[PDB]
Design an enzyme around this catalytic site. Sequence first.
Site, PDB file in Angstrom:
ATOM      1  N   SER B 190      -0.431  -3.287   2.141  1.00 14.41           N
ATOM      2  CA  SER B 190       0.720  -3.508   1.269  1.00 14.41           C
ATOM      3  C   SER B 190       1.303  -4.907   1.381  1.00 14.41           C
ATOM      4  O   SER B 190       2.230  -5.232   0.619  1.00 14.41           O
ATOM      5  CB  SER B 190       1.828  -2.489   1.557  1.00 14.41           C
ATOM      6  OG  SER B 190       1.427  -1.200   1.140  1.00 14.41           O
ATOM      7  N   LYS B 193       1.842  -6.971  -1.840  1.00  9.48           N
ATOM      8  CA  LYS B 193       2.946  -6.781  -2.779  1.00  9.48           C
ATOM      9  C   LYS B 193       3.829  -8.015  -2.903  1.00  9.48           C
ATOM     10  O   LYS B 193       4.464  -8.199  -3.950  1.00  9.48           O
ATOM     11  CB  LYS B 193       3.745  -5.527  -2.408  1.00  9.48           C
ATOM     12  CG  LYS B 193       2.931  -4.255  -2.664  1.00  9.48           C
ATOM     13  CD  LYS B 193       3.452  -3.005  -2.010  1.00  9.48           C
ATOM     14  CE  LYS B 193       2.630  -1.805  -2.347  1.00  9.48           C
ATOM     15  NZ  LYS B 193       2.787  -0.654  -1.447  1.00  9.48           N
ATOM     16  N   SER B 250       7.909  -0.427  -0.277  1.00 12.74           N
ATOM     17  CA  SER B 250       6.459  -0.367  -0.362  1.00 12.74           C
ATOM     18  C   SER B 250       6.008   0.717  -1.340  1.00 12.74           C
ATOM     19  O   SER B 250       4.983   1.355  -1.124  1.00 12.74           O
ATOM     20  CB  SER B 250       5.781  -0.198   1.003  1.00 12.74           C
ATOM     21  OG  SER B 250       4.534  -0.873   1.025  1.00 12.74           O
ATOM     22  N   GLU B 286      -3.370   0.891  -5.447  1.00 10.94           N
ATOM     23  CA  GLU B 286      -2.868   1.767  -4.386  1.00 10.94           C
ATOM     24  C   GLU B 286      -3.300   3.198  -4.689  1.00 10.94           C
ATOM     25  O   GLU B 286      -3.189   3.645  -5.831  1.00 10.94           O
ATOM     26  CB  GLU B 286      -1.349   1.735  -4.330  1.00 10.94           C
ATOM     27  CG  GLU B 286      -0.794   0.470  -3.781  1.00 10.94           C
ATOM     28  CD  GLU B 286      -0.995   0.329  -2.280  1.00 10.94           C
ATOM     29  OE1 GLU B 286      -1.722   1.191  -1.719  1.00 10.94           O
ATOM     30  OE2 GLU B 286      -0.400  -0.577  -1.659  1.00 10.94           O
ATOM     31  N   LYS B 354       7.258  -8.404   4.860  1.00  8.80           N
ATOM     32  CA  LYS B 354       6.559  -7.303   4.217  1.00  8.80           C
ATOM     33  C   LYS B 354       5.446  -6.868   5.150  1.00  8.80           C
ATOM     34  O   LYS B 354       4.661  -7.709   5.615  1.00  8.80           O
ATOM     35  CB  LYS B 354       5.964  -7.701   2.869  1.00  8.80           C
ATOM     36  CG  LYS B 354       5.262  -6.580   2.119  1.00  8.80           C
ATOM     37  CD  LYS B 354       6.284  -5.613   1.510  1.00  8.80           C
ATOM     38  CE  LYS B 354       5.621  -4.310   1.065  1.00  8.80           C
ATOM     39  NZ  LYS B 354       5.391  -3.379   2.194  1.00  8.80           N
ATOM     40  N   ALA B 357       0.031  -1.040   6.393  1.00 13.64           N
ATOM     41  CA  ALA B 357      -0.733  -0.165   7.262  1.00 13.64           C
ATOM     42  C   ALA B 357      -1.853   0.438   6.437  1.00 13.64           C
ATOM     43  O   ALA B 357      -1.657   0.750   5.255  1.00 13.64           O
ATOM     44  CB  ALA B 357       0.136   0.953   7.835  1.00 13.64           C
TER      45      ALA B 357
END
EC number: 3.5.2.6
Lengths: 228, 408
Positions: B190, B193, B250, B286, B354, B357
């Site tokens: 993530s 982003k 997130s 995602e 940011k 995982a």
Amino acid sequence: SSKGEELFTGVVPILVELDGDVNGHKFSVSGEGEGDATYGKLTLKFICTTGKLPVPWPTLVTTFVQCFSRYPDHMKRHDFFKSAMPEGYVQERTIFFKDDGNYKTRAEVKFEGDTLVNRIELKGIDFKEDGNILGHKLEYNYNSHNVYIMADKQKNGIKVNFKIRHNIEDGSVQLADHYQQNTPIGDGPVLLPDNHYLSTQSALSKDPNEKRDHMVLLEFVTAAGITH
Amino acid sequence: LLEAARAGQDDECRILMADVNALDEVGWTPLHLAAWGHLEIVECLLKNGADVNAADIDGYTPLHLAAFSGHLEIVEVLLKYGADVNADDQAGFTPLHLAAIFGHLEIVEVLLKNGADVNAQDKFGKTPRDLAIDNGNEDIAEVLGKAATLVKVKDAADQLGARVGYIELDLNSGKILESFRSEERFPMMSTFKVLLAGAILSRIDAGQEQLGRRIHYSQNDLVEYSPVTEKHLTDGMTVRELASAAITMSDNTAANLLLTTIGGPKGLTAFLHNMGDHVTRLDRWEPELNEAIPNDERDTTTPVAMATTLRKLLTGELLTPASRQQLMDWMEADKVAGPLLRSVLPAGWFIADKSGAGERGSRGIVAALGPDGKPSRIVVIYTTGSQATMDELNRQIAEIGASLIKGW
């Protein structure tokens, strides 16, 4: 390499005056003798003018003129002590006696006429009443040491560090950790050295004609540690 | 032989060889006397078996004396002949402490290269960096700080059984302050982003997008971990709200919806290529982008690419001043990176970050941070491959952070 060094080519008379206060015990010492920097040699006699000295004589040796050290010819540009003369320098120390109290000293070392004079104020605090100092457990002798010298550019002076080892009557050794700073009194230029050391040795004796509390000192100091 | 090294007699050294370790009243051997700048004599003595680690009456080895006097080549030959790089004197000073006190930077570096312990403590608990600071030797303090952080980065990789990539960049100048595995690829997770939000802000600046434009979506768009978007199915969300949700929570559906606006992962990659990042790439949506398959180049960056690109977004000319402030403000309000750098961040410090995982032990963070309420450096940390638990991965990243903060 410095104008001040010319003042030390022969034998120079010395006077030492110390006013001390250790754990509230006030005392004074006067010393006189001569130094011969050509040989790195000092010969001095000190008298306690207030009665019995309340600390052992050896503990005051370092407080009682490093301008008399012998700087070899190739190291003359590293001799801060002589370069500050005749106007002189301030010498400040803290001396930490391991497991015991400390001395704080401030001295001025300068020529007064033809004589090199070292005038000292000493304050000692936090000593143990039956420690090695106030209990007078130190042997009347003195060891050889290495004295480490570094320039302190920001103060136009030097910083000096070393550890003194005082033999105790029971076969132990009392350490005295020395932290020292020297700054010129005058405005003229002084020599700021590269890092180096002095090698010292000292012999303590008594004057058989003297009934007052006193110390006779013969000391030799040579600078080293810089090559060509 | 003691006089033969003072006052040096290097030819006499070989002639006199005699007790190579003869002592005087201060415990000096010939090697101690020669350490003050007599390189050739030091070499002769060492060849003839001089005790390289002999300690004088104060605990000084010849290496200590060479560190004090400043003789780089003598330091080097003593170490070549097996001098104990971490020998401690009676004050607890190692040669590295002495080099840090006395300001000898070149000697600091040789000592570090030869295994000096950057975290060694003297009798009063002080490290060489502590003493460098006390003596105003800022360049040495910085070098020692970076070295201690690399010790921790390598320790983390050991504990995790996995590679760890690291970079610390100066936010203003772009200078790389320290790095490890910085050109290796890692899954972004993530952390991508932040780059997505930069692309959105660039489109806003160009008039190609509006912060207030409302996007409607359906149940079929919802993917796992969509805490904000799942609550707005009926009314939709604006571009602003989606970007906020993607960065600060997130939110995965929010990121996917924003990706569609720019042409998907290929569109984000094109944005990156066009601003000069030819390394970072997004390929999947995602949550598939978190798979972290070994040897898979998809959805990866390198620590240096990500840090450089994030610097250009936050401080460069890529975004208008208002938009680069908006990116920083969103990252400052991150809500789901608590256990990482934030867990060790001291009072008064600023952080905009940011985290990510993924599968196969993948974990990472990108951050702009600094003391006194203002960011001044970018930090990027990535790891992948570990079998460790999430708590273990978090703790290792936090400990890297604590080290770089301590050494700041």
